[PDB]
């Protein structure tokens, strides 16, 4: 009942409906704090193989506290625009270096795990802790000192609860101090969906962003931020989900050309505004990078960072790309190649020069031959669509498609005086450009 | 149109070497893998050998590995097989194939060549031996009488018989040779004609032999009984 | 004696052959079976120390299995195409979520770790079985009440044997359930070249590919699939090579511009397609974005989604580029900067205005300095060249190299109406454009 597709040969490029928006419009800070122990070297100067390896333990353990240390000292895509993706976190980080900041922290935590303080901006954040090793230190393993160690338990013990901070702190290192996908040595599963359940947003949008945590990791961010005292605090930056449920609609396109048995002669057409639509407040949101967007069953997750907003009446160029109210913009070229685009719900082939096209399903082989020109075919009873030397898997969603006919739009235009090397042009800009052609072409 | 054409078969005693080619044009050759297929007299076929396109790989039978080499020369369009230690049986049609597949269950031969013969063979080429084989009272009368020529003990298959210089053409009828033990071969051949008409016309039986140049000719008349 | 270098003066270009293709045509898929347990929190108690390390692992096990549970829910490189990568793995699983195909895989790996299952739809999949933590945990985790553990090495034995299902859930799960590089925590070398040997193809490929396994893993997926009942199961789609053994080249091209001492008044020129070319059943296959074919030795791994079928009359713009047969593609401008190209075995260098170039190898120093124009350098007594503020190294990797001396085409044109800009342009358009520019220069 969800998704269906239309082709339209007038212009050779099909739109698929259906999808369901979840656009990021926002970022919610939070600050994650580890507590350290002051362990300084100590004499014990045994020879027992437990001590030993208790030894190595407390090593790993500096040699990670010193590293964090070190770690902080003193088409249509080239018209978005250029924005700073982690500005928040590090604008709350400048902030938690001040005086007091990490003082007032530290003392309201010490009860409870969980926090809401008010920084001295006056924004007040969720402040987490996560991992408590100073405890395990100061007490139980140097108890009021542990010098002979008489279990082996307490070396296996002490290596799983140091895993974390080591695992961490290779991340950082690797990426100098900045992790874009938050692991789950960053946040737990269970310390996510806690957080999540804090955020002051309605119930809507805690369902949808607790059933796709997945995404929601893919779309955050960690940021190394501070050490000092016993705590060590990193901020992780989340995505808000401001517009969701309204509808979404991806369009495809591919050239479009004549079919002159000359090898030259021929000119060629293209529609340059592919990729996601979604209609959020009044107007449609596009993102030309349709790489931009995760895709869970028909719920799409696009980021508003990468997109242009435009009228409503944009979607008239599905239906009619002669219309007044807006002006199409398509791409003009001489070179005509075959092709294929593969769509929701089955698959465009652009077929030119001596090039032998076909589809073809396992139990029957070849079903259909294709002749010059751009065409359309059904992922119903189609498995594979092979142009040249190529082989193409459809998509084996499930849903309707609808074939319209109409003619070519590039049969209207005359070739001797049709622009070519027209990159970023339109339907009207065309026109201009051959109206003043043919109107200099009048000499007596 | 695409064509294979095989050279370089003959006749060769056990234990020596040949060396087969196959020249292949209509196609571009570097872009294909390339067999060797065998067919002994009377027999099924057997796949030999094969190579790859650049020569990176390279596969051989059971039966003939560690005595035949597979190449190819991709600048001229022939690949060619080397064949060491010949035995009896290697004696057989060696055709070239172009390799056609689906890129993961079906293989198959779609282009075949002609074929070149092989024969590997102990014998020493001998002359042939023609005998007449005049026409008999049991073997006359009733409507017609029949004569004929013998070819005995010839290595060389080759041999070729005509009658009048070719001016005799109905009612010749030519016999497959016989192989015997001693690898020698014999055929006879038999003419029909009229019982009234003996003595009346000439036969003589030529026996034209290429590979001792024995090109003999022997007068088959009635001689008493 | 494997692979040679030539340089052609008159377009500034070189070409390198030698090298063996081996061209992705197709994809295979396998599944992979997890025995998993459905161990109750029916635990008795206990206080030891051996004990709460045993629930410590059974609770990261429970974590991770439910974890996986939430997981699965309901120039010239703009005329290439749009395909979609993992359509037939995912087609795979969704056959697989059909009634008894879970039961069906089941029964028929019980007594063994490889088996063939014919599926609903007819397709016959190769399952195979790779780790068994049902049996362990049965027989070995529950001895009938597991309240009080005699031993330490049972807990390191639990440990380990956990470790491979953690590092599974942890990649699938900061990947949205899909890992483009296969690691060897999803198959082990063993089981690639188990997996390699059982598929119905011939020995050269199987040759190529056991020979190649960090490759084979580098252009493979893997896409979680399906968990339930007792049974973890994802999909793992394998590259098939098609072509293999056939001859491949590189094109390598660099501006050729003009040498007037006025700081305008120079007209640039070049060649726009590069990449790699190699032969495919009477035709090339062309893949202009060079950066996604990986390169072995002497053996090229090209993916033909990413390419365009051309006739071998294309081979002929290297050896005349005003050939009728075919029209070569070129690009025209007015901004002349001086830059560099390493090639296969020496380098091309572009030097124009007042920037100085030289080459230079450890022992001699400097021993070459280029004047205006386009040139080519062997690496043979070469070890960098630099280029205004730039150094570059050389490949020293053994061959050799031809100069083919000749005449700069860009000489042969008219500066007047020359046409100054042409991204998408071939010989034949500028001809044209130059023909139409010269015939309305006419008096009265």
């Known amino acids: 009942q969800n998704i269906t597709e239309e082709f339209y040969q007038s212009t050779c490029s099909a739109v698929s409906k259906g999808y369901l928006s979840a656009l990021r419009t926002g970022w919610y800070t939070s600050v994650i704090t580890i507590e350290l122990s002051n362990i300084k070297e100590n004499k014990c100067n045994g020879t027992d193989a437990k001590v030993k390896l208790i030894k190595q333990e407390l090593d790993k353990y500096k040699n990670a506290v010193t590293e964090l240390q070190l770690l902080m000292q003193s088409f249509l895509g080239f018209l978005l625009g250029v924005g700073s993706a982690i500005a928040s976190g590090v604008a709350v980080c400048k902030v938690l270096h001040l005086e007091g900041e990490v003082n007032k922290i530290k003392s309201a935590l010490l009860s409870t795990n969980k926090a809401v303080v008010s920084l001295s901006n006056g924004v007040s954040v969720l402040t987490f802790k996560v991992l408590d090793l100073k405890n395990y230190i100061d007490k139980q393993l140097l108890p009021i000192q542990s010098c002979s160690i008489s279990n082996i338990e307490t070396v296996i013990e002490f290596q799983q609860k140091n895993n974390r901070l080591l695992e961490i702190t290779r991340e950082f290192s690797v990426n100098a101090g900045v992790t874009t996908p938050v692991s789950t040595y960053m946040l737990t599963n269970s310390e996510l969906l806690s957080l999540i359940n804090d955020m002051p947003i309605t119930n809507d949008q805690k369902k949808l962003m607790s059933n796709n945590v997945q995404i929601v990791r893919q779309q955050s961010y960690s940021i190394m931020c501070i050490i000092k005292e016993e705590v060590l605090a990193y901020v992780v930056q989340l995505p808000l989900y401001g517009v969701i449920d309204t509808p979404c609609w991806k369009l495809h396109t591919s050239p479009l050309c004549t079919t002159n048995t000359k090898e030259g002669s021929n000119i060629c057409l293209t529609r340059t505004d592919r990729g996601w639509y979604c209609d959020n407040a009044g107007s449609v949101s596009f993102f030309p990078q349709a790489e931009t967007c995760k895709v869970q069953s028909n719920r799409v997750f696009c980021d508003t960072m990468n997109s242009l907003t435009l009228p409503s009446e944009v979607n008239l160029c599905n239906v009619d790309i002669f219309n007044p109210k807006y002006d199409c913009k398509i791409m003009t070229s001489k070179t005509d190649v075959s092709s294929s685009v593969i769509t929701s719900l089955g698959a465009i082939v652009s077929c030119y020069g001596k090039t032998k096209c076909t589809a073809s399903n396992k139990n029957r082989g070849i079903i259909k031959t294709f002749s010059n020109g751009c065409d359309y075919v059904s992922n119903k009873g189609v498995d594979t669509v092979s142009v040249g030397n190529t082989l193409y898997y459809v998509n084996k969603q499930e849903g309707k498609s609808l074939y319209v006919k109409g003619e070519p739009i590039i049969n209207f235009y005359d070739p001797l005086v049709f622009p070519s090397d027209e990159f970023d042009a339109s339907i009207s800009q065309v026109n201009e450009k051959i109206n003043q052609s043919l109107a200099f072409i009048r000499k007596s | 149109q695409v064509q294979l054409v095989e050279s370089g078969g003959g006749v060769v005693k056990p234990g020596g070497s040949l060396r087969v080619s196959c020249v292949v044009s209509?196609?571009?050759?570097?872009?294909?893998?390339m067999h060797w297929v065998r067919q002994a007299p009377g027999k099924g076929l057997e796949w030999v050998s094969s190579?790859?396109?650049?020569?990176?790989?390279?596969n051989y039978a059971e039966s003939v590995k560690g005595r035949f080499t597979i190449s190819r020369d991709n600048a001229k369009n022939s690949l060619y097989l080397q064949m060491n230690s010949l035995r009896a049986e290697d004696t057989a049609v060696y055709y070239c194939?172009?390799?056609?597949?689906?890129?993961?269950?079906?293989?198959?031969?779609?282009?075949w060549g002609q074929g070149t013969l092989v024969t590997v063979s102990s014998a020493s080429t001998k002359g042939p031996s023609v005998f007449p084989l005049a026409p008999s009272s049991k073997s006359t009368s009733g409507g017609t009488a029949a004569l004929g020529c013998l070819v005995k003990d010839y290595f060389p298959e080759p041999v070729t018989v005509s009658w009048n210089s070719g001016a005799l053409t109905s009612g010749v009828h030519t016999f497959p040779a016989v192989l015997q033990s001693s690898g020698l071969y014999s055929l006879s051949s038999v003419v029909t004609v009229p019982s009234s008409s003996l003595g009346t016309q000439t036969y003589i039986c030529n026996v034209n032999h290429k590979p001792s140049n024995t090109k003999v000719d022997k007068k088959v008349e009635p001689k008493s009984c | 004696q494997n692979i040679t270098e030539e340089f052609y003066q008159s377009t500034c270009s070189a070409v390198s052959k030698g090298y063996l293709s081996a061209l992705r045509t197709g994809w295979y898929t396998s599944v992979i079976t997890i025995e998993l347990s459905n161990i109750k929190e029916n635990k008795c108690n206990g206080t030891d120390a051996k004990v709460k390390l045993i629930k410590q692992e059974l609770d990261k096990y429970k974590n991770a299995v439910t974890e996986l549970q939430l997981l699965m829910q309901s120039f010239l490189g703009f005329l290439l195409g749009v395909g979609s990568a993992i359509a037939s793995g995912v087609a795979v699983c969704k056959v697989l979520h059909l009634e008894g195909e879970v039961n069906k895989i089941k029964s028929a790996l019980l007594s063994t770790n490889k088996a063939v299952v014919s599926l609903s739809n007819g397709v016959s999949v190769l399952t195979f079985k790779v780790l068994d933590l049902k049996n362990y945990i049965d027989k070995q985790l529950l001895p009938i009440q597991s309240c009080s553990i005699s031993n330490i090495e049972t807990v390191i034995e639990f440990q380990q044997k956990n470790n491979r299902l953690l590092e599974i859930t942890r990649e699938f799960s900061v990947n949205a359930g899909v890992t483009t590089p296969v690691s060897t925590y999803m198959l082990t070398n063993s089981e690639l070249l188990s997996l390699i040997n059982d598929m119905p193809i011939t020995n050269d490929q199987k040759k190529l590919m056991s020979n190649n396994v960090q490759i084979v893993r580098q252009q493979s997926y893997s896409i979680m699939c399906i968990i339930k009942e007792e049974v973890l199961a994802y999909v793992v789609q394998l590259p098939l090579y098609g072509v293999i053994d056939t001859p491949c080249w590189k094109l390598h091209t660099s501006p050729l511009c003009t040498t007037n001492t006025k700081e305008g008044s120079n007209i640039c020129l070049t060649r726009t397609d590069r990449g790699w070319y190699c032969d495919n059943a009477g035709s090339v296959s062309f893949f202009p974005q060079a950066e996604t074919c990986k390169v072995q030795s002497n053996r090229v791994f090209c993916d033909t989604m990413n390419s365009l079928t051309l006739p071998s009359e294309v081979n002929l713009c290297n050896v005349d580029i005003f050939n009728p047969k075919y029209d070569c593609k070129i690009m025209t401008s007015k901004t002349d900067v001086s830059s560099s190209v390493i090639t296969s075995l020496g380098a091309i260098v572009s030097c124009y205005g007042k920037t100085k170039c030289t080459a230079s190898n450890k022992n001699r120093g400097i021993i070459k300095t280029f004047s205006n124009g386009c040139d080519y350098v062997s690496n043979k007594g070469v070890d960098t060249v630099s280029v205004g503020n730039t150094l570059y190294y050389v490949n020293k990797q053994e061959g050799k190299s031809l100069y083919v001396k000749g005449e700069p085409i860009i000489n042969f044109y008219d500066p007047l109406v020359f046409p100054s800009d042409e991204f998408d342009a071939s010989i034949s358009q500028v001809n044209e454009k130059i023909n139409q520019s010269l015939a309305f220069i006419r008096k009265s």
């Open positions: 194939a172009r390799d056609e597949n689906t890129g993961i269950s079906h293989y198959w031969f779609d282009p």
């Open positions: 209509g196609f571009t050759f570097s872009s294909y893998r």
């Open positions: 190579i790859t396109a650049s020569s990176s790989y390279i």
